[PDB]
Amino acid sequence: FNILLATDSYKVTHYKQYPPNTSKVYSYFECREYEETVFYGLQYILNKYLKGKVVTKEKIQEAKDVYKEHFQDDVFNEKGWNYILEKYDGHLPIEIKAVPEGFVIPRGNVLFTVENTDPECYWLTNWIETILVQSWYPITVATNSREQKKILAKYLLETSGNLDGLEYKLHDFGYRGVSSQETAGIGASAHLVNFKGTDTVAGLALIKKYYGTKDPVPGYSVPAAEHSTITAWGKDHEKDAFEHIVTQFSSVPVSVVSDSYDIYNACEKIWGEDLRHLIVSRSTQAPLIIRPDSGNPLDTVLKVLEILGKKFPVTKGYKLLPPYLRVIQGDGVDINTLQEIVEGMKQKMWSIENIAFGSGGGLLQKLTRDLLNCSFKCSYVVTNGLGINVFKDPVADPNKRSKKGRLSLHRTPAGNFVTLEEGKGDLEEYGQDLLHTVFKNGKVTKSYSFDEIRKNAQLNI
Amino acid sequence: FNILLATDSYKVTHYKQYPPNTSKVYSYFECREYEETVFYGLQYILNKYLKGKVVTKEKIQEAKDVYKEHFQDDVFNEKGWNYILEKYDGHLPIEIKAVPEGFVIPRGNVLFTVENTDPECYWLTNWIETILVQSWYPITVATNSREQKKILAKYLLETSGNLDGLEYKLHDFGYRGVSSQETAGIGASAHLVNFKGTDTVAGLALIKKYYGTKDPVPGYSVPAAEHSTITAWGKDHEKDAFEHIVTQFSSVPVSVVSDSYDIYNACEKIWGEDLRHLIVSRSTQAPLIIRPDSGNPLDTVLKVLEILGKKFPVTKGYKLLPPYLRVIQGDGVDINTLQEIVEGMKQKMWSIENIAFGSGGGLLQKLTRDLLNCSFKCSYVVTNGLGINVFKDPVADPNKRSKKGRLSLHRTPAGNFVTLEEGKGDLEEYGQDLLHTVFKNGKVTKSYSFDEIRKNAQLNI
Ligand SMILES: NC(=O)c1ccc[n+]([C@@H]2O[C@H](COP(=O)(O)O)[C@@H](O)[C@H]2O)c1
Numbered sequence A, B: 001f002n003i004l005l006a007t008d009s010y011k012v013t014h015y016k017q018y019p020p021n022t023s024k025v026y027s028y029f030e031c032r033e034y035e036e037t038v039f040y041g042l043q044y045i046l047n048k049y050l051k052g053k054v055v056t057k058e059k060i061q062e063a064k065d066v067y068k069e070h071f072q073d074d075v076f077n078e079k080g081w082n083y084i085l086e087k088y089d090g091h092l093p094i095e096i097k098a099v100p101e102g103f104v105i106p107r108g109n110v111l112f113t114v115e116n117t118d119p120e121c122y123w124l125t126n127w128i129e130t131i132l133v134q135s136w137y138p139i140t141v142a143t144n145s146r147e148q149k150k151i152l153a154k155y156l157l158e159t160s161g162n163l164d165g166l167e168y169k170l171h172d173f174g175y176r177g178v179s180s181q182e183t184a185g186i187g188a189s190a191h192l193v194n195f196k197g198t199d200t201v202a203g204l205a206l207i208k209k210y211y212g213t214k215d216p217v218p219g220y221s222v223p224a225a226e227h228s229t230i231t232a233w234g235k236d237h238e239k240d241a242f243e244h245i246v247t248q249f250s251s252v253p254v255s256v257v258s259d260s261y262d263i264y265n266a267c268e269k270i271w272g273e274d275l276r277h278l279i280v281s282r283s284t285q286a287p288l289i290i291r292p293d294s295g296n297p298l299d300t301v302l303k304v305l306e307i308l309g310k311k312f313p314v315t316k317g318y319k320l321l322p323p324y325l326r327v328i329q330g331d332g333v334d335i336n337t338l339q340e341i342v343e344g345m346k347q348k349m350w351s352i353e354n355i356a357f358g359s360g361g362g363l364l365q366k367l368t369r370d371l372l373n374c375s376f377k378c379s380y381v382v383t384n385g386l387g388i389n390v391f392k393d394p395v396a397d398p399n400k401r402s403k404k405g406r407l408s409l410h411r412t413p414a415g416n417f418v419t420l421e422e423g424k425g426d427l428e429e430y431g432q433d434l435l436h437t438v439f440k441n442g443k444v445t446k447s448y449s450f451d452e453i454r455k456n457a458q459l460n461i
């Protein structure tokens, strides 16, 4: 990894575009005004990509040769980097201030800020914008996940009276659905800020390496079948597949995909008759978890619950299946369908304790920077020894307006958050800044554990 | 990276669910029936994650410790992996056949197959499904990027009778909008299969390391301004920013974002009057590229085109701006809005040679496995010494039905593609199988250069 090659190309030519005599470039990151976002992921970026000696004679050479060919010109600021190499032993003269990871802050607030600690490197602050803006992913995943947790708590509570098992209603199935091995780990860890159910193993590695927890692992899983593990027996032997797997994993929870050929036939006949004796004998701590994987998410769940209800003993006002029988909808689930499904179940008078959800692509991939409008902007800049407040303000789009001057975040007397502009924070009217330095001159100054982060992101419930 | 930790959690328990006496598991990947996909990206995966000695005593122990806590049970198939370490020195007893990369194949066709080469490793085939499926991303970006090229080619050919400069009509801006550094490079290289304009430097590295090109680099870029490059000067001194920039880059093409305050009160006044002399004086090889970044993409472009048309000399029957002035729409661009904009310009009688497009999130992030239905499935298995064709066929979703038995791809006598199922491919009816062994027993057996891929992915016309 060469940080000199980890930025938008045009940013290579920027050092020649700022106002002469500029000794400071101050920028900030916000989820421009999901009215509530979870701040998570910076630490990962700090350690893995910005910490220590990121500049070397070799890397400078490599960049030089690349850009020379990339621009068909020699715009690369070779001298600017050698400076950092020769004076700071390849460490970035920058200071990043940010809110504690895990913090739930309303939109339109400053989350973190970046500024060069050396006037000569006034061009460095925005050079690292590209790599820093990717924190949108961890923030969005955690937030979107947390909002799904809210939807689940609301309905689980309404239909059962408690939230027993909430931490496991949304299971991560997004490993194969994301765009890369790295994205898998980042996103899966973001999801674990809110839940404990995951099949995206890469998530456990990242958390262990960059954040850490008291317990051995942040998330857990259970044995489960996949289509190949069923179809391999042959269509005529689907029942044999089911019987084998349930017996193999008899003393623990086990999920078996039942839609290989006909999910309904499977629930009514196979599970409800042919193997019924193997199911009802199951412990409450190790139930069978039937798993549909096709057709309309809400219709299939209701139709599957309706059938199992005629084959098994169904019992606050909502119908509950036997403690040894459960269902998991792990197909076509995203924040929107999730809402439709629980509301759809609530209507049909089905308790939510009867179900769990598996979300992959909709949980870790179908997310974008526009969702929370994660943006990095220049608000302050010193030119000719004079500090002026800068900002954009497109005419045809008042939403894209950025904040002005030096920023700071404060806890308001009423216990809320307020972001102050134009250095007004220096006047601690609402107390001291909430943003703390987490990085400075190649050194990670402040770090948080996954346990802290999890605590900070708890729901009000 | 630990391949023993790079799979979906439930796949760790699959070895105990397969039919007993199973010696082989044969699976395939396809983009279930965008009626034409660009196969690209496997080579990156094979070399970086599957090649060589990927199994070691350490990795076995690590994987064992994690899964013991993850499953709260000891289910990890330690004996299975030790066998691989002792028998093949950590090399994966797997063989992967695949259609040449860059190949443009219609959908519903097998793109690559996987199977174990040693009976005791029948479980390995689907253990690596998770990591192999992520190839959906490169395949999708490249395909989406190629379809957009078709659109640009169609309208640029009707408005100017020549595809000159098509290669640079769609610039990659998605570096910051993507979920990770690795995704950025993977996706960027994918886009570069069809174009040469990019700002996502990560892509140049990956191509150089895993594919290689005749030329020094796959993509190129030109100097461009950023909002902070304009606003740093101050609201009142926007014209100064513009002048300084166009001057700094007076001999090379330059892009200047001009919507920081008022896009229209910038093209008519500043660019059309105040600094017009610095513009009409520019070379055809270093024009001024005006860049709006907000408001309706189509409307802003059309309105900006009329302004510039009434301040500069305008000339197949379609309007054209002086060779020293051009426009790039680098906001709100995706496959769909791209079509609309080129369409809108056509109805307004403007030539496409007048504009270029920059796409970020829409290009590399707003995509999922759903788009092309990229799926990995088991089609052939050998149990009790006999091989049977297997597959899924969900009642409620005919679309999710999978192919049966050993597969092969063939070039029809009409220069088309066809997938022969049930090993019927052994019969040289339509020639020889196009799937080539690319990986076997831990070694990459066949590779392609980026030049071959681009060649294989070319468009008709
Ligand atoms: N434990 C499990 O049953 C499990 C885990 C991971 C992925 N998957 C499968 O892959 C899919 C997830 O990917 P998407 O949600 O992105 O389509 C699911 O629909 C499911 O069929 C299943």
Ligand SMILES: NC(=O)c1ccc[n+]([C@@H]2O[C@H](COP(=O)(O)O)[C@@H](O)[C@H]2O)c1
Residues within 6 Å of the ligand: A008, A009, A010, A369, B172, B173, B174, B175, B176, B177, B199, B224, B225, B255, B293, B330, B331, B332, B333, B358, B359, B360, B361, B362
């Ligand atoms: N050369 C360039 O002008 C350039 C390069 C990379 C990113 N960008 C910015 O980032 C945006 C693209 O990212 P998204 O389309 O994903 O929001 C553009 O609208 C632009 O404002 C601009």
